[PDB]
Design an enzyme around this catalytic site. Structure first.
Site, PDB file in Angstrom:
ATOM      1  N   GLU B  71      -4.531  -3.894 -16.963  1.00 24.92           N
ATOM      2  CA  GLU B  71      -3.913  -3.686 -18.259  1.00 24.92           C
ATOM      3  C   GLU B  71      -3.411  -5.041 -18.760  1.00 24.92           C
ATOM      4  O   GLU B  71      -2.678  -5.722 -18.031  1.00 24.92           O
ATOM      5  CB  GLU B  71      -2.775  -2.674 -18.160  1.00 24.92           C
ATOM      6  CG  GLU B  71      -2.250  -2.196 -19.497  1.00 24.92           C
ATOM      7  CD  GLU B  71      -0.928  -1.473 -19.379  1.00 24.92           C
ATOM      8  OE1 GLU B  71      -0.454  -1.274 -18.243  1.00 24.92           O
ATOM      9  OE2 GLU B  71      -0.365  -1.099 -20.428  1.00 24.92           O
ATOM     10  N   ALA B  99      -5.416   2.800 -15.209  1.00 23.73           N
ATOM     11  CA  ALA B  99      -5.737   3.815 -14.220  1.00 23.73           C
ATOM     12  C   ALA B  99      -5.150   5.178 -14.543  1.00 23.73           C
ATOM     13  O   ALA B  99      -5.409   6.132 -13.803  1.00 23.73           O
ATOM     14  CB  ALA B  99      -5.260   3.369 -12.838  1.00 23.73           C
ATOM     15  N   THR B 145      -3.156   1.799 -10.154  1.00 24.09           N
ATOM     16  CA  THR B 145      -3.643   0.554  -9.579  1.00 24.09           C
ATOM     17  C   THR B 145      -2.962   0.267  -8.251  1.00 24.09           C
ATOM     18  O   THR B 145      -3.623  -0.015  -7.245  1.00 24.09           O
ATOM     19  CB  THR B 145      -3.412  -0.592 -10.555  1.00 24.09           C
ATOM     20  OG1 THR B 145      -3.783  -0.180 -11.871  1.00 24.09           O
ATOM     21  CG2 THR B 145      -4.235  -1.803 -10.164  1.00 24.09           C
ATOM     22  N   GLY B 146      -1.634   0.339  -8.225  1.00 23.74           N
ATOM     23  CA  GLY B 146      -0.897   0.060  -7.012  1.00 23.74           C
ATOM     24  C   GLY B 146      -1.217   1.003  -5.878  1.00 23.74           C
ATOM     25  O   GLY B 146      -1.191   0.595  -4.713  1.00 23.74           O
ATOM     26  N   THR B 179       9.012   8.688 -12.535  1.00 22.21           N
ATOM     27  CA  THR B 179       8.446   8.382 -13.844  1.00 22.21           C
ATOM     28  C   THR B 179       7.011   8.875 -13.942  1.00 22.21           C
ATOM     29  O   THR B 179       6.192   8.285 -14.646  1.00 22.21           O
ATOM     30  CB  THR B 179       8.497   6.886 -14.129  1.00 22.21           C
ATOM     31  OG1 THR B 179       7.595   6.200 -13.254  1.00 22.21           O
ATOM     32  CG2 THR B 179       9.892   6.355 -13.922  1.00 22.21           C
ATOM     33  N   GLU B 254       5.501 -12.368  13.683  1.00 23.74           N
ATOM     34  CA  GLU B 254       6.519 -11.874  14.598  1.00 23.74           C
ATOM     35  C   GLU B 254       7.127 -10.564  14.125  1.00 23.74           C
ATOM     36  O   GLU B 254       7.722  -9.837  14.929  1.00 23.74           O
ATOM     37  CB  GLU B 254       7.616 -12.918  14.772  1.00 23.74           C
ATOM     38  CG  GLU B 254       7.115 -14.349  14.773  1.00 23.74           C
ATOM     39  CD  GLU B 254       8.074 -15.326  15.425  1.00 23.74           C
ATOM     40  OE1 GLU B 254       9.219 -14.937  15.738  1.00 23.74           O
ATOM     41  OE2 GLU B 254       7.675 -16.489  15.633  1.00 23.74           O
TER      42      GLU B 254
HETATM   43  N1  LIG Z   1      11.090  -2.461  -9.323  1.00 25.75           N
HETATM   44  C1  LIG Z   1      10.276  -2.283 -10.345  1.00 25.75           C
HETATM   45  N2  LIG Z   1       9.459  -1.180 -10.369  1.00 25.75           N
HETATM   46  C2  LIG Z   1       8.624  -0.990 -11.406  1.00 25.75           C
HETATM   47  C3  LIG Z   1       8.587  -1.897 -12.442  1.00 25.75           C
HETATM   48  N3  LIG Z   1       7.677  -1.471 -13.334  1.00 25.75           N
HETATM   49  C4  LIG Z   1       7.136  -0.321 -12.884  1.00 25.75           C
HETATM   50  N4  LIG Z   1       7.727  -0.006 -11.698  1.00 25.75           N
HETATM   51  C5  LIG Z   1       7.402   1.159 -10.872  1.00 25.75           C
HETATM   52  O1  LIG Z   1       6.095   1.564 -11.203  1.00 25.75           O
HETATM   53  C6  LIG Z   1       5.990   2.963 -11.301  1.00 25.75           C
HETATM   54  C7  LIG Z   1       5.093   3.309 -12.480  1.00 25.75           C
HETATM   55  O2  LIG Z   1       3.736   3.066 -12.181  1.00 25.75           O
HETATM   56  P1  LIG Z   1       3.163   1.577 -12.018  1.00 25.75           P
HETATM   57  O3  LIG Z   1       3.538   0.994 -10.683  1.00 25.75           O
HETATM   58  O4  LIG Z   1       3.688   0.728 -13.141  1.00 25.75           O
HETATM   59  O5  LIG Z   1       1.572   1.718 -12.157  1.00 25.75           O
HETATM   60  P2  LIG Z   1       0.743   0.459 -12.698  1.00 25.75           P
HETATM   61  O6  LIG Z   1       0.823  -0.676 -11.716  1.00 25.75           O
HETATM   62  O7  LIG Z   1       1.251   0.057 -14.056  1.00 25.75           O
HETATM   63  O8  LIG Z   1      -0.765   0.975 -12.828  1.00 25.75           O
HETATM   64  P3  LIG Z   1      -1.090   2.163 -13.851  1.00 25.75           P
HETATM   65  O9  LIG Z   1      -0.766   3.478 -13.193  1.00 25.75           O
HETATM   66  O10 LIG Z   1      -2.546   2.119 -14.224  1.00 25.75           O
HETATM   67  O11 LIG Z   1      -0.248   1.977 -15.085  1.00 25.75           O
HETATM   68  C8  LIG Z   1       7.400   3.490 -11.455  1.00 25.75           C
HETATM   69  O12 LIG Z   1       7.638   4.525 -10.535  1.00 25.75           O
HETATM   70  C9  LIG Z   1       8.322   2.326 -11.172  1.00 25.75           C
HETATM   71  O13 LIG Z   1       9.196   2.633 -10.108  1.00 25.75           O
HETATM   72  C10 LIG Z   1       9.404  -3.007 -12.417  1.00 25.75           C
HETATM   73  O14 LIG Z   1       9.370  -3.811 -13.341  1.00 25.75           O
HETATM   74  N5  LIG Z   1      10.255  -3.201 -11.364  1.00 25.75           N
HETATM   75 MG   LIG Z   2      -0.274  -0.013 -15.318  1.00 20.09          MG
END
Ligand SMILES: Nc1nc2c(ncn2[C@@H]2O[C@H](COP(=O)(O)OP(=O)(O)OP(=O)(O)O)[C@@H](O)[C@H]2O)c(=O)[nH]1
Ligand SMILES: [Mg+2]
Ligand SMILES: CC(=O)O[C@H]1C(=O)[C@@]2(C)[C@H]([C@H](OC(=O)c3ccccc3)[C@]3(O)C[C@H](OC(=O)[C@H](O)[C@@H](NC(=O)c4ccccc4)c4ccccc4)C(C)=C1C3(C)C)[C@]1(OC(C)=O)CO[C@@H]1C[C@@H]2O
Ligand SMILES: Nc1nc2c(ncn2[C@@H]2O[C@H](COP(=O)(O)OP(=O)(O)O)[C@@H](O)[C@H]2O)c(=O)[nH]1
Ligand SMILES: Nc1ncnc2c1ncn2[C@@H]1O[C@H](COP(=O)(O)OP(=O)(O)O)[C@@H](O)[C@H]1O
Lengths: 428, 441, 346
Positions: B71, B99, B145-146, B179, B254
């Protein structure tokens, strides 16, 4: 980049579009000449989500008028923002429908939908990556119910993996502006539930209530009603245009808010709606907006979720605000009002936060909700439908132009089965 | 000499990487334009250390990081932001589409056509190395993605690279807060595929940091900046032994030997005890005897999981600052004396210790304070079984009715994958029960 | 009061799999079936209503072809004569025992001939002059949620595969508009019609093996018996229609492991969607028998929609699942089992 095509079908659609573009421009700085005179750079960065680029730093949108009565063309052309549209996209026909759905699906629409798709494809292939579509149209009429549904059924057959929204202005309970609304609406839902991905039910009596009670407007016209529908249309495509700390898009909302492919009918809402004097006696914060976005009197669906259970709810904020408040307040709604929510989805709330707010506000919001309550909209139509089909009141205007009673009973049974689908997730 | 690659994957990944590099540039002296005013005045030394950064002839220092979101909205902030002239364009915007909160797009459809460039840049950055040790992958369960891209990438790396410490710094779903409605479906399917290929997966939760920042830093209205500026300190406490000098330098090979007994329980936690502000920076001594207890005191952990409901399979305490070892030994003894802090019969030792002399820095425009000594406690518990159990309960409540599955099968998925990813978490919830039962003499 | 009665059948080692000394992962005890990996760490159990242990031709309870017929299909015959409707499902990954189980070989056939011949024998026994018997067949398929007919000899063009449509008559229910309905009274007609049909089926070559089905195929029969003789004269008011529906379905095709894009993935997505909707129908309809208010989503798929009147109310459905006990097919096999499990569930 993601890109949108905005088809507009019927008087309602073509009158909403003239307001939606009037606002998106204001958000992006474009003038009625197509030229940019903004101040910031965020306006031009993701401008291709709705616009295309012309010769001399002009900007021309992806709008497609599809009407069949030219009475609405010259109103848009001879307006404050009509000199930017592409004239090759002003499709029109003659010998209009007559508030008939068969003269918009079969007779007159079958002569013009080819000419319309020849433009839809042109405005698609210019997109490096198409995300979806938009259709502004009013059930209850002929060209918005028939020709729009035809175009949905054909665009999805041609472009199935993409998105196809529809900002349907559905009928109202008490005072309808057409006698044969139920037929034209049932036969539209018969082809929308099978060929849509997210649909946004809008009702005009609810917008009257909003314009009278919350905004304190003694003389509300349709330009004021479309001013609210535009706001909602903007809210969904904000994290696609402008950045954010937690982004969103059509498809994320589709995954979260559509548990099953049939239940994609949504009650929208937008906050902060307030009077022009009561803005001195408020505090634009997250909790006040959440109070509004969940209140029955702000939803544009003419149906109380207090009668039903939110299967899945969303929220698309805009402005420099906290995510902690966004999480806590929505959880407080999930807990405090847990009777109005489903237990086999523990988190019934989605979130989405942009950082670049609307033209003159420090913070705004938006709301989408999938509730069982909207069965009342359709059950009611059925109770109208079989009141007339049982005696065949206005049928000979639908059969003569090509139709059968089978196409009516199909739609009746489908609508009723959808009333029953939302019903099982309401009591137990 | 000792390098470590950083793979930020997703919005959370970049929002944390910005906070991490904002710190790693201030510590060593590097500017956003990759330059160094200070040490060049002397004409010697290696302050901009070659573990995380590279070097060039004109003084430009380049980080060893790869960024990807599917994105554009996030990475274009870097390209148009303050740190645009630092990164090589290995920031991968392939975000013609995202995604959509589904594991299926990041894993199969939208994941393919994007992963090969990530592997190629990882390879180009590894050839520069002279004995790398690490792959710190930042990601987020619940997203697409994550959840997916991380799994695919680790599955490819464990083949193409092999015996390298593929570490993960992940965000765990809050039990109440979230979320996304289909977050557990993504989390379970992420774990099922990463439970083999990863080696150690640290875990945080945004609810715990909120509770902390309102209890200790006294922030009623925070943002994600104030969370990632605290996560960056954890990661710096992890990586300090490589970048800087110190008595007991503790590296990344370690961790996976001390905190990971079996290859299926590689899910430790984290906590930063000195989270006090300048108002409270005074009136406190901030000695080791206070901090080592704060790290074990609930209401200061970064994953809402009460270890009093469980036990401790291991623990690593990475100090930094004016810390004398004897205070650490006294602190560990005090912790071993307490009855609430339960330890397994198969780990009487329990602790690993690490000490560094460089204190934490103070990212200006921030909320933390200047302390002379800071600590990070990694910990492996039997308590986190409760959280996997909760997520499996949610998964069951939703999948019994086959909710939201059509979006996944629409992008190359099969219900068998759901049941398969479920049962391999019941097995883990049973392993956590098996190991936590004391040995039968 | 509907009953479902899903089942399983484990094939024996083929000679090819024998000469490899391939391992045995599926075991039984009593009625329950279990899958023990080569790792021998995780052990499962999948107890069923019916189980056909065909691992050898020596074991007690060896469920031969005659057994499989007489235990599942014959009740469907006795119900089709009672004026009810019946559906049979044949799920199974490639190489599992499916076509052998439905059709069979010339020397030990399957279920379909033992259905049609039992039918014709009971008919010509019951074929008096008072009551008659009329069998009308059809054979169609599904492909990307489009309908197609397998009883036409296509002239060689790009295609004459008419993308037919489904309609809903209110009384008689769903139907296909424009469907060939041939008449048969000797079984050798059905074989010719099916051999002209299955050639027109949809399939293509991929990794695991080439001749893999990629379309559901329904084989429907309509038994109308003209028994009604009114007292006053030769009038026949009431006439009993019995619909039988035997469907050979496809596999799931986990596409994360098998690289496939374009049309093949477009087919696999639709097969998986249909399989899920079918599982949902069956898991709701087994609970229907237990007085629990549940709505059945017939409409999310053409297959379950056209059979709303053959999987609801007064009928007897059935599902037979063929799985291999080999060790190179443990990922596949388990899936099938779990599918069937979610159908029985009690
Ligand atoms: N600590 C922290 N967590 C975040 C942040 N932005 C998003 N998140 C976490 O990300 C989750 C939302 O999905 P994303 O991780 O953003 O998914 P993505 O990496 O954007 O990939 P997509 O699903 O395709 O949008 C939430 O549950 C948040 O907890 C951030 O800036 N800081
Ligand atoms: Mg995203
Ligand atoms: C400082 C001040 O008090 O002026 C406000 C204002 O009075 C209020 C009441 C505005 C005002 O809006 C209305 O009164 C209204 C009446 C009928 C129907 C719809 C709106 C306002 O006109 C609307 C306008 O809202 C915007 O600025 C956005 O740009 C809005 N669209 C337009 O302004 C617009 C501009 C040019 C042409 C057409 C429309 C918008 C909303 C959502 C998404 C994008 C844009 C603003 C700040 C105000 C005024 C001007 C008084 C409100 O409008 C919105 C959509 O938020 C009505 O309640 C809100 C809160 C604002 O305080
Ligand atoms: N909000 C809004 N609704 C409209 C507008 N024009 C018509 N409608 C609604 O649309 C319905 C009539 O649909 P119509 O546009 O005439 O359909 P058509 O004749 O086929 O193009 C009525 O119920 C109106 O309430 C408009 O400008 N704004
Ligand atoms: N019950 C059984 N007894 C002996 N052999 C069997 C049995 N079931 C299947 N087979 C063998 O397995 C093979 C199945 O081939 P095929 O008809 O392609 O099955 P499918 O259609 O399920 O892939 C046949 O060659 C047959 O010899």
């Amino acid at each position: 980049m993601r890109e949108i095509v905005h088809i507009q079908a019927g008087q309602c659609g073509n009158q909403i579009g003239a307001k939606f573009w009037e606002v998106i421009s204001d958000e992006h700085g474009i003038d009625p000449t197509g030229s940019y005179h903004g101040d910031s750079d965020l306006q031009l960065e993701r401008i291709n989500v709705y616009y295309n680029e012309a010769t001399g730093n002009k900007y021309v949108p992806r709008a497609i008028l599809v009407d069949l009565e030219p009475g609405t063309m010259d109103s848009v052309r001879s307006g404050p923002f009509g000199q930017i549209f592409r004239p090759d996209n002003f499709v029109f026909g003659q010998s209009g429908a007559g508030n008939n759905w068969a003269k918009g699906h079969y007779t007159e629409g079958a002569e013009l939908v080819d000419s319309v798709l020849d433009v839809v494809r042109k405005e698609s292939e210019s997109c490096d990556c198409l995300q979806g579509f938009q259709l502004t149209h009013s059930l209850g009429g002929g060209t918005g119910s028939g020709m729009g549904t035809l175009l949905i059924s054909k665009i999805r057959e041609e472009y199935p993996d993409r998105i196809m929204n529809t900002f349907s202005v559905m009928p109202s309970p008490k005072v309808s502006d057409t006698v044969v609304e139920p037929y034209n609406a049932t036969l539209s839902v018969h082809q929308l539930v099978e060929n849509t991905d997210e649909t946004y039910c809008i009702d005009n009596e609810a917008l009257y209530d909003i314009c009278f009670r919350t905004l304190k407007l003694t003389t509300p016209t349709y330009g004021d009603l479309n001013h609210l529908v535009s706001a909602t249309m903007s809210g969904v495509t904000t994290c696609l245009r402008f950045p954010g700390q937690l982004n969103a898009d059509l498809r994320k909302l589709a995954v979260n808010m559509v548990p099953f492919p049939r239940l994609h009918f949504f009650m929208p809402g937008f906050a902060p709606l307030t009077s022009r004097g009561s803005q001195q006696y408020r505090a634009l914060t997250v909790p006040e907006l959440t109070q509004q976005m969940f209140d029955s009197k702000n939803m544009m669906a003419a149906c109380d979720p207090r009668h039903g259970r939110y299967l899945t709810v969303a929220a698309i904020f805009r402005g420099r605000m906290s995510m902690k408040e966004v999480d806590e307040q929505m959880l407080n709604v999930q807990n405090k009002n847990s009777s109005y929510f489903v237990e086999w989805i523990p988190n019934n709330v989605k979130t989405a936060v942009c950082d670049i707010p609307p033209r003159g506000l420090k913070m705004s919001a938006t709301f989408i909700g999938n509730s069982t309550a909207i069965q009342e909209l359709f059950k009611r139509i059925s109770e109208q439908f079989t009141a007339m089909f049982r005696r065949k009141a206005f049928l000979h205007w639908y059969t003569g132009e090509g139709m059968d009673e089978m196409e009516f009973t199909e739609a009746e049974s489908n609508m009723n089965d959808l009333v029953s689908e939302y019903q099982q997730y309401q009591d137990a | 000499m000792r390098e470590c690659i950083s793979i930020h994957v997703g919005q959370a990944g970049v929002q944390i990487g910005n906070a991490c590099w904002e710190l790693y540039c201030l510590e060593h002296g590097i500017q956003p334009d990759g330059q160094m005013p200070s040490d060049k005045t002397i004409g010697g030394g290696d302050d901009s250390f070659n573990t995380f950064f590279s070097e060039t002839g004109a003084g430009k220092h380049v980080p060893r990081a790869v960024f990807v979101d599917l994105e554009p909205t996030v990475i274009d902030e870097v390209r148009t932001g303050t740190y645009r002239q630092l990164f090589h364009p290995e920031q991968l915007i392939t975000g013609k589409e995202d995604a959509a909160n589904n594991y299926a797009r990041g894993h199969y459809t939208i994941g393919k056509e994007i992963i090969d460039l990530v592997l190629d840049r990882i390879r180009k950055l590894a050839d520069q190395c002279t004995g790398l040790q690490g792959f710190l992958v930042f990601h987020s369960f619940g997203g697409g993605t994550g959840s997916g891209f991380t799994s695919l990438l680790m599955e490819r790396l464990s083949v193409d690279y092999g015996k390298k410490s593929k570490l993960e710094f992940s965000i765990y779903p809050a039990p109440q807060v979230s979320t996304a409605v289909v977050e557990p479906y993504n989390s379970i399917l992420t774990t099922h595929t990463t439970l083999e290929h990863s080696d150690c997966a640290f875990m945080v939760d945004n609810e715990a940091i909120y509770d902390i920042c309102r209890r200790n830093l006294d922030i009623e209205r925070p943002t994600y900046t104030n969370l990632n500026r605290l996560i960056s300190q954890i990661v710096s406490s992890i990586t300090a032994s490589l970048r800087f000098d110190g008595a007991l330098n503790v590296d990344l090979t370690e961790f996976q030997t001390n905190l990971v007994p079996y290859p299926r329980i590689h899910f430790p936690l984290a906590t930063y005890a000195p989270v006090i502000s300048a108002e409270k920076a005074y009136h406190e001594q901030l000695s080791v005897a206070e901090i080592t207890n704060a790290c074990f005191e609930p209401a200061n952990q970064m994953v809402k999981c009460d270890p009093r409901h469980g036990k401790y399979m291991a623990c690593c305490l990475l100090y930094r600052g004016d810390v004398v070892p004897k205070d650490v030994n006294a602190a560990i003894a005090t912790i071993k004396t307490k009855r609430s802090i339960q330890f397994v019969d198969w780990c009487p030792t329990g602790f690993k210790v690490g000490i560094n002399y460089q204190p934490p820095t103070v990212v200006p425009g921030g909320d933390l304070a200047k302390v002379q000594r800071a600590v990070c406690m990694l910990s492996n518990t039997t308590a986190i079984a409760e959280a996997w159990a909760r997520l499996d309960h949610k998964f069951d409540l939703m999948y019994a009715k086959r909710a939201f599955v059509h979006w996944y099968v629409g992008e190359g998925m099969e219900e068998g994958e759901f049941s398969e990813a479920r049962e391999d978490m019941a097995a883990l919830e049973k392993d956590y029960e098996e190991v936590g039962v004391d040995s039968v003499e | 009061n509907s009953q479902v009665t899903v089942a399983v059948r484990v094939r024996p080692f083929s000679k090819r799999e024998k000469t490899e000394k391939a391992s045995q992962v599926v075991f039984t005890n009593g009625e329950e079936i279990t899958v023990e990996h080569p790792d021998m760490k995780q052990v499962y159990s999948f107890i069923y209503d019916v189980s056909f242990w065909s691992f050898d031709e020596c074991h007690p309870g060896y469920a031969s072809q005659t057994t499989v017929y007489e235990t599942l299909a014959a009740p469907l015959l006795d119900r089709a004569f009672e004026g009810y409707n019946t559906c049979l499902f044949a799920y199974g990954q490639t190489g599992s025992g499916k076509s052998y189980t439905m059709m069979g070989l010339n020397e030990e056939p399957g279920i379909i001939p033992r259905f049609c011949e039992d039918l014709f024998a009971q008919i010509a026994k019951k074929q008096t002059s008072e009551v008659s018997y009329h069998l009308e067949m059809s054979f169609f398929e599904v492909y990307n949620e489009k309908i197609h007919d397998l009883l036409v000899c296509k002239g060689e063009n790009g295609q004459r595969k008419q993308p037919l449509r489904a309609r809903e008559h209110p009384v008689s229910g769903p139907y296909v508009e424009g469907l060939s309905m041939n008449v048969v009274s000797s079984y050798s007609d059905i074989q010719s019609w099916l051999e002209l049909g299955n050639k027109q089926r949809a399939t293509a070559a991929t990794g695991m093996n080439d001749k893999s089905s990629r379309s559901h195929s329904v084989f429907t029969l309509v038994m109308t018996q003209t028994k009604t003789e009114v007292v006053e004269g030769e009038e026949h008011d009431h006439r009993i229609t019995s619909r039988i529906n035997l469907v050979d379905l496809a596999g799931s095709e986990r596409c994360s492991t098998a690289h496939s894009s374009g049309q093949r993935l477009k087919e696999g997505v639709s097969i998986n969607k249909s399989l899920l909707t079918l599982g949902k129908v069956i898991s709701a309809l087994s609970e229907q028998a237990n007085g629990k208010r549940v709505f059945i989503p017939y409409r999310e798929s053409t297959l379950t929609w056209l059979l709303k009147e053959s999987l609801g109310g007064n009928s007897k459905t059935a599902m037979i699942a063929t799985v291999s006990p080999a060790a190179s097919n443990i990922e596949e096999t388990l899936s099938t089992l779990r599918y069937a499990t979610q159908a029985r569930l009690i």
